[PDB]
Design a protein around this ligand. Structure first.
Ligand code: ZN
Ligand code: ZN
Ligand code: ZN
Ligand code: ZN
Lengths: 219, 215, 220, 219
């Protein structure tokens, strides 16, 4: 269409600009054949992982689903994880949520959107699991809180997969991370759950939930 | 692993530069609340979609899995599609493959990599479906061709989903595209399958396979 | 292997011992072509459902998975449910668990069994959801308790699917049930959740959970 | 609906004429703590597997889905398979289809039935793969030919899982079976694909398809 044509046009301009600029981008990219980080983010993709981290092209192995989830039985995401860990031997997996997430808003919404609702039912279970902390919070602020709690809960799901547990068990070096960034400042903020073993997973997980449960008198 | 640290050092340096330097990047980003294109790419993510298309930040709804697949029964991908079509009202779903795809290479290698092998079995089925064509090539050239055929097949699976078919049924405007770019120059290349209805899906899909089978 | 040769023998025997009688089992089946109940049970399949309900053959539509679960995002079971509801128009969906369940035991066990642990992590999430309650119970009981709670939580999951909500919402006749029979008794024990609409689902689930939270003598 | 009562009734009686009868059953059934067979059948479930095999109560580990499928990426069925193999040590996995199958008919009809159609696309793919054969066949015969072909294709899929390949690889005993019974007579019939290793799967699978490709006068 109009938009598709425009897109091919931008692509051509860019691609050839590189051609002329004798740009070494693609060659650089070719130097970093194997990625070192598995980035699991949201399909909203407000601020690209490349921009947030300014890493060298090819360093990131990416997976994106609605609301950056790691569901216990999702073959898709688990496939990406097992491949990044057992094959590419990646040592850092990073789950990253973001504020003003459509996935979060849709989950909290009472409208029944169809197939996607089922996928969002996992976020709702997370919402109620922390219903007290959240309810004890002002509406306008809950979204950002569920978004932050979501990340901690997903890092916790990743760390419990048979895949990740076996990696640690057999002495492989692997650390899980969980961050969130505000779509307005672009700053990555650690949510607290950071594991390098099942032990650190449990502790950092309890610790993060405990920290998030300590509310200021601003609600 | 000073990596994570160095990683946060990069983010701070970047977001800091933006603030003090007064960058309306987040201001503009905030303008485009609803995306207009669903991009289904590969987890290898060699050349970011944002770059390949040089689009305005926020315009793309993105899904990435190993080898840019649209498996008939994948709840993950189908959910992204249903939400994007039925909820965000996106009108263009773009499946994009890429040369030198590790996913495609793993599907071809005969080694048990574990869980991921089951995910790649779908690729191996596509390989057999086009075995006559692919059998004429060397392992090397076979990989480049399977990459292109894979994209065509995925577009074909996407257009066969009940989600996309019902969108066309009630008259919603929706087009499917399947492309591939070489990791060496970044030029996006149409593979031939472009649909706006079920009938056009069948026609272009057949024509595309017919065209791809000529050496 | 004799097991397969033997097994095939039984079949021939059964089948022939039917053909000679000019029996009508293969007729009293082609009449009940369309089922009226969707049975969702465990892969353990201790006491068969065709025997627990003594229903005429062909009346059940069945799906079995480890520990009878209805996971929000499981395409397999949601497909069975959707096809049951929207295409077969069946009106009753039963989620029947059973006592002394490997699934439940495996979920509670600390051992890492491989792939299946991931599927069981849903049971373990349920387990912690009711951590306090279950904690108070007596070990030899905890297992059987979770079995019961699990079924409750499964009906609630089923009731929360878009497939069932849209059914009700469009005025289609459909009820959800959740029981737990015992391998010894064989008596189907209703658990409390019996949604017929989303309002029901909420109340019954709410109560069923309240009822199970009231511990008796035995359980410490 | 009194159907639940009328049904709940049959249970109190049947289960009664076992207590007030000291009928072993629950006594014996309990003796078979572990099953030796994994049965993968269609949710239709015309003739139960308990009456088809006439095995001993509790011997079967069962999984049923629409049209008895083993989809490469189905977490549900792969979990049942893996558990039965790596944990229950079952050495026999049987896939059983049946004539006049709803899943097969629905898969062959153009009618978009909703979510289920996505599940059945895997069958339509099998249909296209054997399009020439099935085409040469006769209309009122296609359904049954695809039903047999389907069982063959599923055993193949099952033999190709990493779970099974690995079981074989480490020297575990395991055979795959693919049969189909006619709802009109309950006669179990081997479709030809029987495997005890990756090598027998291949030959057995190729032979079985070759045989089915042979069409008798009555299309
Ligand atoms: Zn988001
Ligand atoms: Zn790739
Ligand atoms: Zn069980
Ligand atoms: Zn069937």
């Amino acid at each position: 269409m109009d938009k598709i044509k425009q897109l091919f046009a931008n692509n051509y301009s860019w691609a050839q600009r590189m051609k002329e600029e004798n740009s070494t981008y693609f060659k650089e990219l070719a130097d970093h054949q194997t990625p070192h980080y598995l980035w699991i983010g949201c399909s909203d993709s407000r601020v690209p992982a490349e921009k947030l981290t300014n890493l060298e092209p090819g360093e990131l192995f990416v997976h994106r689903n609605v609301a950056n989830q790691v569901i216990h039985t999702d073959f898709n995401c688990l496939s990406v994880v097992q491949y990044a860990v057992d094959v590419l031997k990646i040592e850092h997996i990073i789950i990253c949520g973001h504020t003003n997430c459509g996935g979060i808003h849709a989950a909290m919404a009472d409208k029944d959107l169809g197939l996607i609702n089922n996928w969002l039912l996992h976020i709702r279970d997370i919402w109620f699991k922390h219903g007290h902390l959240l309810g004890k919070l002002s509406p306008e602020k809950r979204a950002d809180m569920l978004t932050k709690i979501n990340v901690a809960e997903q890092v916790y799901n990743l760390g419990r997969t048979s895949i990740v547990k076996s990696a640690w068990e057999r002495g492989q070096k692997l650390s899980l991370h969980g961050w969130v960034y505000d779509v307005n400042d672009g700053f990555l903020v650690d949510q607290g759950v950071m594991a390098t073993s099942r032990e650190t997973l449990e502790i950092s997980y309890r610790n993060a939930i405990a920290r998030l449960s300590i509310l200021d008198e601003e609600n």
